[PDB]
Design a protein around this ligand. Sequence first.
Ligand SMILES: COc1cc(N2CCOCC2)ccc1N
Ligand SMILES: [Cl-]
Ligand SMILES: [Cl-]
Length: 182
Amino acid sequence: MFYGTVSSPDSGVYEMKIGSIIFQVASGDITKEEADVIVNSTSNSFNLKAGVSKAILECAGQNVERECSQQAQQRKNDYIITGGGFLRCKNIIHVIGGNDVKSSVSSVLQECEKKNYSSICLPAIGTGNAKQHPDKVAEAIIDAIEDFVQKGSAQSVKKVKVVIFLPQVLDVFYANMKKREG
Ligand SMILES: COc1cc(N2CCOCC2)ccc1N
Ligand SMILES: [Cl-]
Ligand SMILES: [Cl-]
């Protein structure tokens, strides 16, 4: 039904269409990317600084750190939205690494439509301190995008890119894409 063909447009980058959306994967430092939204994978307190969350909070800066802890105290949040600080994005969406990854990605997609955003960059959510298994994480991320497309919800969102710190986790995402391709 929805899946196009897997190819490599640039060195180390792999992509396929899912309906109208270009889905891409690559290995690297997510804090060097430009996108409307960058996703952080963090703790239920939104103040973790290990792995991806270390890089994101250090580069984003202290105002973003402060924003996170202020929203954390205000209410019980499944995720929070902050400014981009000194990252190259309009907003950071901080999701809980231990939560259901499909649900987290669905929420990111819906929040990006609400802002008329076109591009998203996320890590392999949950594979860091939360210690979720890489193939379950890959299956969940791609399933969330498929569901969003199937329901006719894609309008402003055009590009979803996963930038993955460990090259061995990239392998797992590529194999999952190949399983689905048309
Ligand atoms: C940016 O996210 C990560 C970082 C690291 N490491 C930091 C550098 O030294 C040790 C590995 C390992 C896994 C992830 N996801
Ligand atoms: Cl994590
Ligand atoms: Cl990663």
